[PDB]
Amino acid sequence: DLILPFYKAGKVSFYQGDLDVLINFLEPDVLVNAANGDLRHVGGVARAIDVFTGGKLTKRSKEYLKSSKAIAPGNAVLFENVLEHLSVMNAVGPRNGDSRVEGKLCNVYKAIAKCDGKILTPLISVGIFKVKLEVSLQCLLKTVTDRDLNVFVYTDQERVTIENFFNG
């Protein structure tokens, strides 16, 4: 492997890198999108995924909303094979100060863990939805307990925070 994790907790591996490079080298079947409820794909995760699929994620999203329930926080919807052997799991997390941030976050991870194959995911709700990294991380660890999972972050700071959480 060209790209190796900076931490591994049980079956959960943690990576730092640009999204396109992690997809290319880690070869996921399922990519989790940090979605917003109206599926406008903006931000460091959602725009990068859209672009990687040549705009197909957005095409499928517009199609989806013609006949399908908007995605409420706490839920996720899988678009299968947005590209051949790359499904996008559109996970909509809670925002800081919503009710039941932890229950909704944890439910998102429960949905993510039911997907098939190799999964590559960011930490849901961390960044612009302003949930503390450790709250999202704790829900992930608590919920996805016996399942191979790959988690990515972009910044040095985020990596350190994750390392500090485990190092104590």
Compute the distance between CA of residue 163 and CA of residue 58 in angstroms, rounded to an integer.
Answer: 34
Rg (CA), the chain: 15
Token pair in block for residue 1: 């492997």
How far from the centroid of its chain's Cα atoms is residue 94's Cα? Answer: 13
φ, ψ for residue 130, nearest 5 deg: 65, 20
CATH number of the domain to which 97 belongs: 3.40.220.10
How was it solved? X-ray
Compute the distance between CA of residue 127 and CA of residue 95 in angstroms, rounded to an integer.
Answer: 10
φ, ψ for residue 119, nearest 5 deg: -105, 135
Question: Domain total for the chain?
Answer: 1
Name the amino acid, one letter, at 131. V
Token pair in block for residue 46: 């959602």
Question: What sign does the dihedral 4-11-75-164 (CA atoms) show?
Answer: negative
φ, ψ for residue 164, nearest 5 deg: -60, -40
Domain span at residue 35 reads 1-168
CA-closest candidate to residue 125, choices 36, 40, 39, 53: 36
DSSP code per residue over 104-159 = HHHHHHHHHHTS-S-EEE--TT-STT---HHHHHHHHHHH--SS-EEEEE--HHHH
Q: What is the resolution of this structure in A?
A: 2.2
